[PDB]
Amino acid sequence: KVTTVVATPGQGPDRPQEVSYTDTKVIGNGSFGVVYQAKLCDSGELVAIKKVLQDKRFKNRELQIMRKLDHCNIVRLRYFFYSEVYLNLVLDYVPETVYRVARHYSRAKQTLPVIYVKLYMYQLFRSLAYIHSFGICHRDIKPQNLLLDPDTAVLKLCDFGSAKQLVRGEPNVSYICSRYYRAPELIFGATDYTSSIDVWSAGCVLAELLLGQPIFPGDSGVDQLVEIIKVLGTPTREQIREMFPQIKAHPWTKVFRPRTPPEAIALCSRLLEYTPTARLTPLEACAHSFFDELRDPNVKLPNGRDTPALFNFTTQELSSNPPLATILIPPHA
């Protein structure tokens, strides 16, 4: 019925408090453990609780990363507590994901309206700009990790179980990231990759939202590679070095359906690039013309509501390229 724990607030100083929740139901199982949904007794607010076995030999990386994140497009750590000992992350509950929503449209043989593609992708790139400004790479960007509130069109990035700060010259494991969304340098087993792998994944999500299906499917690395090559063409010797069947590149305009906005395709082509340093940074993507509509003072949601927070950039968020502020923050913001 009612569970009462002593939990430490996610943000702010380490001062624990009694927190009572109820209506606990399971909403997900995984390699990490279990995600519950519960209701806070004090406020009626819905939370997700992610339960993981605690390393005991060290501090939990996910927890350390989440306690220092504060951004409106990243799911909020409200509390954490301990309960073989387990670490429980209490997060704001979000009712949907890009995965289930994309699933709804594909099953109905429709595509998600481009206005939602713009809103969702833009917010994803902001969450990335934010975590990348700390040197933190998410390393598992995929539709199941993109939470959505369909009423307000707010997107929140979740799951920082793979996230890690990438320091130049330090090797990192290549076996991160989920099939379909893996950068080609990961497939090739590179251990010197950069945060731009997040950008490649984000481009895969964009292409999927436009196509109604994954752009580079395959149950093996070789199949994925074959699909990437069918689109990008055969990588050059130099492109390979930066990260085989000789195939000529398929014109990007012929990859998507006829009614697809050319700005959407141009954005795709600048995200999905062999050479990791040639991909757009998240902040640059935010500033891409594909998102200009979002910066239009007259824009509204299909449901009639105002757009959610889009322009509340901080100095930290802009730090990779401060003069983009002039594009990113429109006159009416």
Using CA atoms, how far residue 78 sits from 63, 75, 130, 304, in Å, is 12, 9, 19, 30
Q: For residue 156, which of 324, 309, 18 has the smallest C-alpha distance?
A: 309
Residues 46 and 37 sit within 8 Å (Cβ to Cβ) = yes
Q: Which residues pair with 47 in a beta bridge?
A: 38, 92
d(CA 50, CA 64): 15
Q: Which one of residues 21, 93, 291, 313 is an interface residue with ligand 2WG (CB under 6 A)? A: 93
Give burial (CB, 10 Å; 0-12/13-18/19+) of 321: middle
147-176 positions binding ligand 2WG, by CB under 6 A:
147, 158-159, 161
SS3 251: coil
- The pair of structure tokens assigned to 322 is 């401060």
Q: Which one of residues 5, 19, 75, 90 is an interface residue with ligand 2WG (CB under 6 A)? A: 75
Residue closer to ligand 2WG, measured from CB, 131 or 265: 131
Amino acid type, 143: P
d(CA 149, CA 154): 5
Stretch that binds ligand 2WG, among 13-21, 23-31, 269-277, 297-305 (CB under 6 A): 23-31
Residue 30 is a binding residue for ligand 2WG (CB under 6 A): yes
Stretch that binds ligand 2WG, among 30-38, 77-85, 130-138, 188-196 (CB under 6 A): 30-38
55 is known as an active-site residue = no
Distance from chain centroid for Cα 82? 27
d(CA 214, CA 17): 44
Smallest gap, in angstroms, from Cβ of residue 145 to ligand 2WG?
7
Residue closer to ligand 2WG, measured from CB, 45 or 223: 45
200-219 positions binding ligand 2WG, by CB under 6 A:
none
The active-site residue out of 140, 149, 151, 219 is 140
Residue 96 is a binding residue for ligand 2WG (CB under 6 A): yes
Length of the chain: 333
161 labelled ligand-binding: no
50 labelled ligand-binding: yes
31 labelled ligand-binding: yes
d(CA 20, CA 46): 12
Residue closer to ligand 2WG, measured from CB, 75 or 129: 75
Residue closer to ligand 2WG, measured from CB, 138 or 279: 138
**Residues in touch with ligand 2WG (CB under 6 A):** 27-28, 30, 32, 35, 48, 50, 75, 91, 93-97, 147, 158-159, 161
Residue numbers belonging to the annotated binding site for ATP = 27-35, 50
> Would you please indicate which residues are annotated as catalytic (active-site) residues?
140
